[PDB]
């Protein structure tokens, strides 16, 4: 099970509201 999120809060290509983060993915295997 793979879930990826982009914490960046952006509106328009030239504006990000909060702080900067890379995209991250998390995998869960049972």
């Amino acid at each position, epitope marked *: 099970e793979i879930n990826c*999120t982009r*914490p960046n*809060n952006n509106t328009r290509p030239g504006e990000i509201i*909060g*702080d*900067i*983060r*890379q995209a*991250h993915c998390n995998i869960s295997r049972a």
Partner: nanobody
Amino acid sequence: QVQLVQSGAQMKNPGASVKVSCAPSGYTFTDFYIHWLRQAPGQGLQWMGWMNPQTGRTNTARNFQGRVTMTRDTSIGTAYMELRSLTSDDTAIYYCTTGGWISLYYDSSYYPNFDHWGQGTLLTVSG
């Protein structure tokens, strides 16, 4: 032991600029956000901004849109808050605080978790 040591009190004439410093020790400077707030007796608690010690990226309150600059000197691990075009309304105690723990997986810049506080810096604007 965590200490946030701020620079001393200052008197500025109106129109001038003030640069307040905040040197944290007793923990990893780059692990937590740094916030800036200020307080006057005849007003409440006024949040001014945040800074990410790692990258130097900041965000400032709307009311300080373009008269505030927050920076940091990495070699001496010291945060700076500069306030320009002072008036008598800027007379206040200014505080540097710690903030949320910095994680790769989410943004905690806006967490009002101010565990530790500087001793404060009294700005007087007379002129």
